[PDB]
């Protein structure tokens, strides 16, 4: 077992409904040579995430927004998306006056490939994988095309006014969203993306309701993921239905945080729950299967990747209440199905 202090409390690796990532740990597939974009709030400064981190990006375009005194820039910072007093809008509902910072880009990058038996903190799915860190999201969310702009350039799309991505990614993890349909130019830019080679991983969103209903999930071609909890049953907030492909842990899940309500303050470690958390899991297990596929000089298209991934889910805890997808991402099975028993 990694030696992390932490990752005991880690059952989402290892446990009963967990995704079998120690087995292939065990197996000498770590993720190796893979690159996983995680475009999300951008990336903190801290000791177990820094090592297994690439250069990344800053999309978001509203320098208020950004909360670092630029528009567009090369320095993927998390600096908290929290607000007060009303700053997102919804005066005078009680309900929208604030919230604190998510830390959320650290916490699912954390998931994916936090640095790994260094002693300290916890373990990551794909720990011998690199992240390349994507901003898109600060304070009152993020806009459309500072999304879509971040996915495209994950992939090695140019962008304008962006130098050119030196490290393309061939996994993106999407752990954001929200209600709406895919247009046919949101449509277009994700093809343009999966079509040079890369899996976009998506979650499925938080609302229980049907995942079509939302963004990018209603969108074709991507890898749409519920979230379970220890029980193995559909976590009561995940999103469901004929648009999720797979379900992976995402209640109760130990990842890389900040304990800073507002700006960064100290690194930590910190339990959260949504899909978004289910969906890295997906992304590091993905990575997992590429550096077994790589170990055999076998390329696999995001068509075959994601085959892979929803034909060996492992099963769910008897029937749930709702579709979601084919079982529980399982990473030992899954690197069965490239390199035999
Ligand atoms: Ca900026
Ligand atoms: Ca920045
Ligand atoms: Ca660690
Ligand atoms: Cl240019």
């Known amino acids: 077992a990694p030696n992390d202090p932490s990752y005991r409390q880690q059952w989402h690796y290892f446990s009963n409904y967990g995704v079998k990532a120690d087995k292939v740990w065990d197996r000498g597939f770590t993720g190796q040579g893979v690159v996983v974009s995680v475009v999300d709030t951008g990336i903190l400064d801290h000791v177990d995430l820094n090592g297994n981190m690439l250069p990344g990006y800053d999309f978001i375009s509203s320098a208020p927004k950004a909360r670092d005194g630029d528009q567009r820039?090369?320095?993927?910072?998390?600096?908290?998306?929290?607000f007060d007093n009303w700053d997102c809008g919804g005066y005078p509902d009680p309900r929208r006056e604030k919230r604190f910072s998510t830390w959320h880009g650290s916490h699912?990058?954390?998931?994916?490939?936090?640095?790994?038996?260094?002693?300290?903190?916890?373990?990551g799915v794909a720990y011998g994988a690199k992240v390349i860190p994507v901003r898109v999201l600060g304070k009152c969310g993020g806009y459309d095309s500072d999304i879509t702009d971040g996915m495209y350039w994950s992939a090695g799309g140019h962008i304008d006014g962006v130098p050119d991505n030196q490290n393309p990614a061939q996994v993106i993890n999407m752990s954001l969203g929200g209600d709406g349909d895919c247009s046919q130019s949101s449509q277009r830019i994700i093809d343009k993306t999966t079509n040079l080679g890369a899996l976009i991983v998506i979650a499925a969103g938080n609302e229980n309701q049907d995942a079509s209903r939302t963004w990018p999930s209603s969108c074709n071609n991507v890898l749409s993921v519920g979230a379970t909890t220890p029980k193995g049953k559909r976590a009561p907030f995940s999103n469901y239905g004929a648009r999720v492909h797979?379900?992976?842990?995402?209640?109760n899940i130990l990842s890389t945080?900040?304990?800073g309500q507002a700006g960064p303050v100290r690194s930590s470690y910190?339990?959260?729950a949504g899909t978004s958390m289910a969906a890295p899991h997906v992304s590091g297990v993905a990575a997992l299967v590429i550096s077994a596929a790589n170990?055999?000089?076998?390329?696999?298209?995001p068509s075959e990747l994601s085959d892979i991934l929803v034909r060996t889910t492992s099963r769910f805890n008897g029937r749930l209440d709702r579709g979601l997808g084919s079982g529980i991402v399982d990473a030992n099975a899954a690197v069965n199905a490239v390199l035999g028993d």
């Not at 820039?73 to 929290?82: I, K, L, S, T, V």
């Not at 797979?246 to 209640?251: I, K, R």
């Not at 170990?295 to 298209?301: D, N, V």
């Open 73 to 82: 820039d090369n320095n993927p910072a998390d600096e908290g998306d929290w």
């Open 270 to 272: 910190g339990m959260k």
């Open 246 to 251: 797979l379900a992976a842990p995402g209640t």
């Open 108 to 123: 699912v990058a954390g998931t994916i490939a936090a640095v790994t038996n260094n002693g300290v903190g916890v373990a």
């Open 257 to 259: 945080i900040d304990v």
């Open 295 to 301: 170990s055999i000089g076998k390329t696999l298209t």
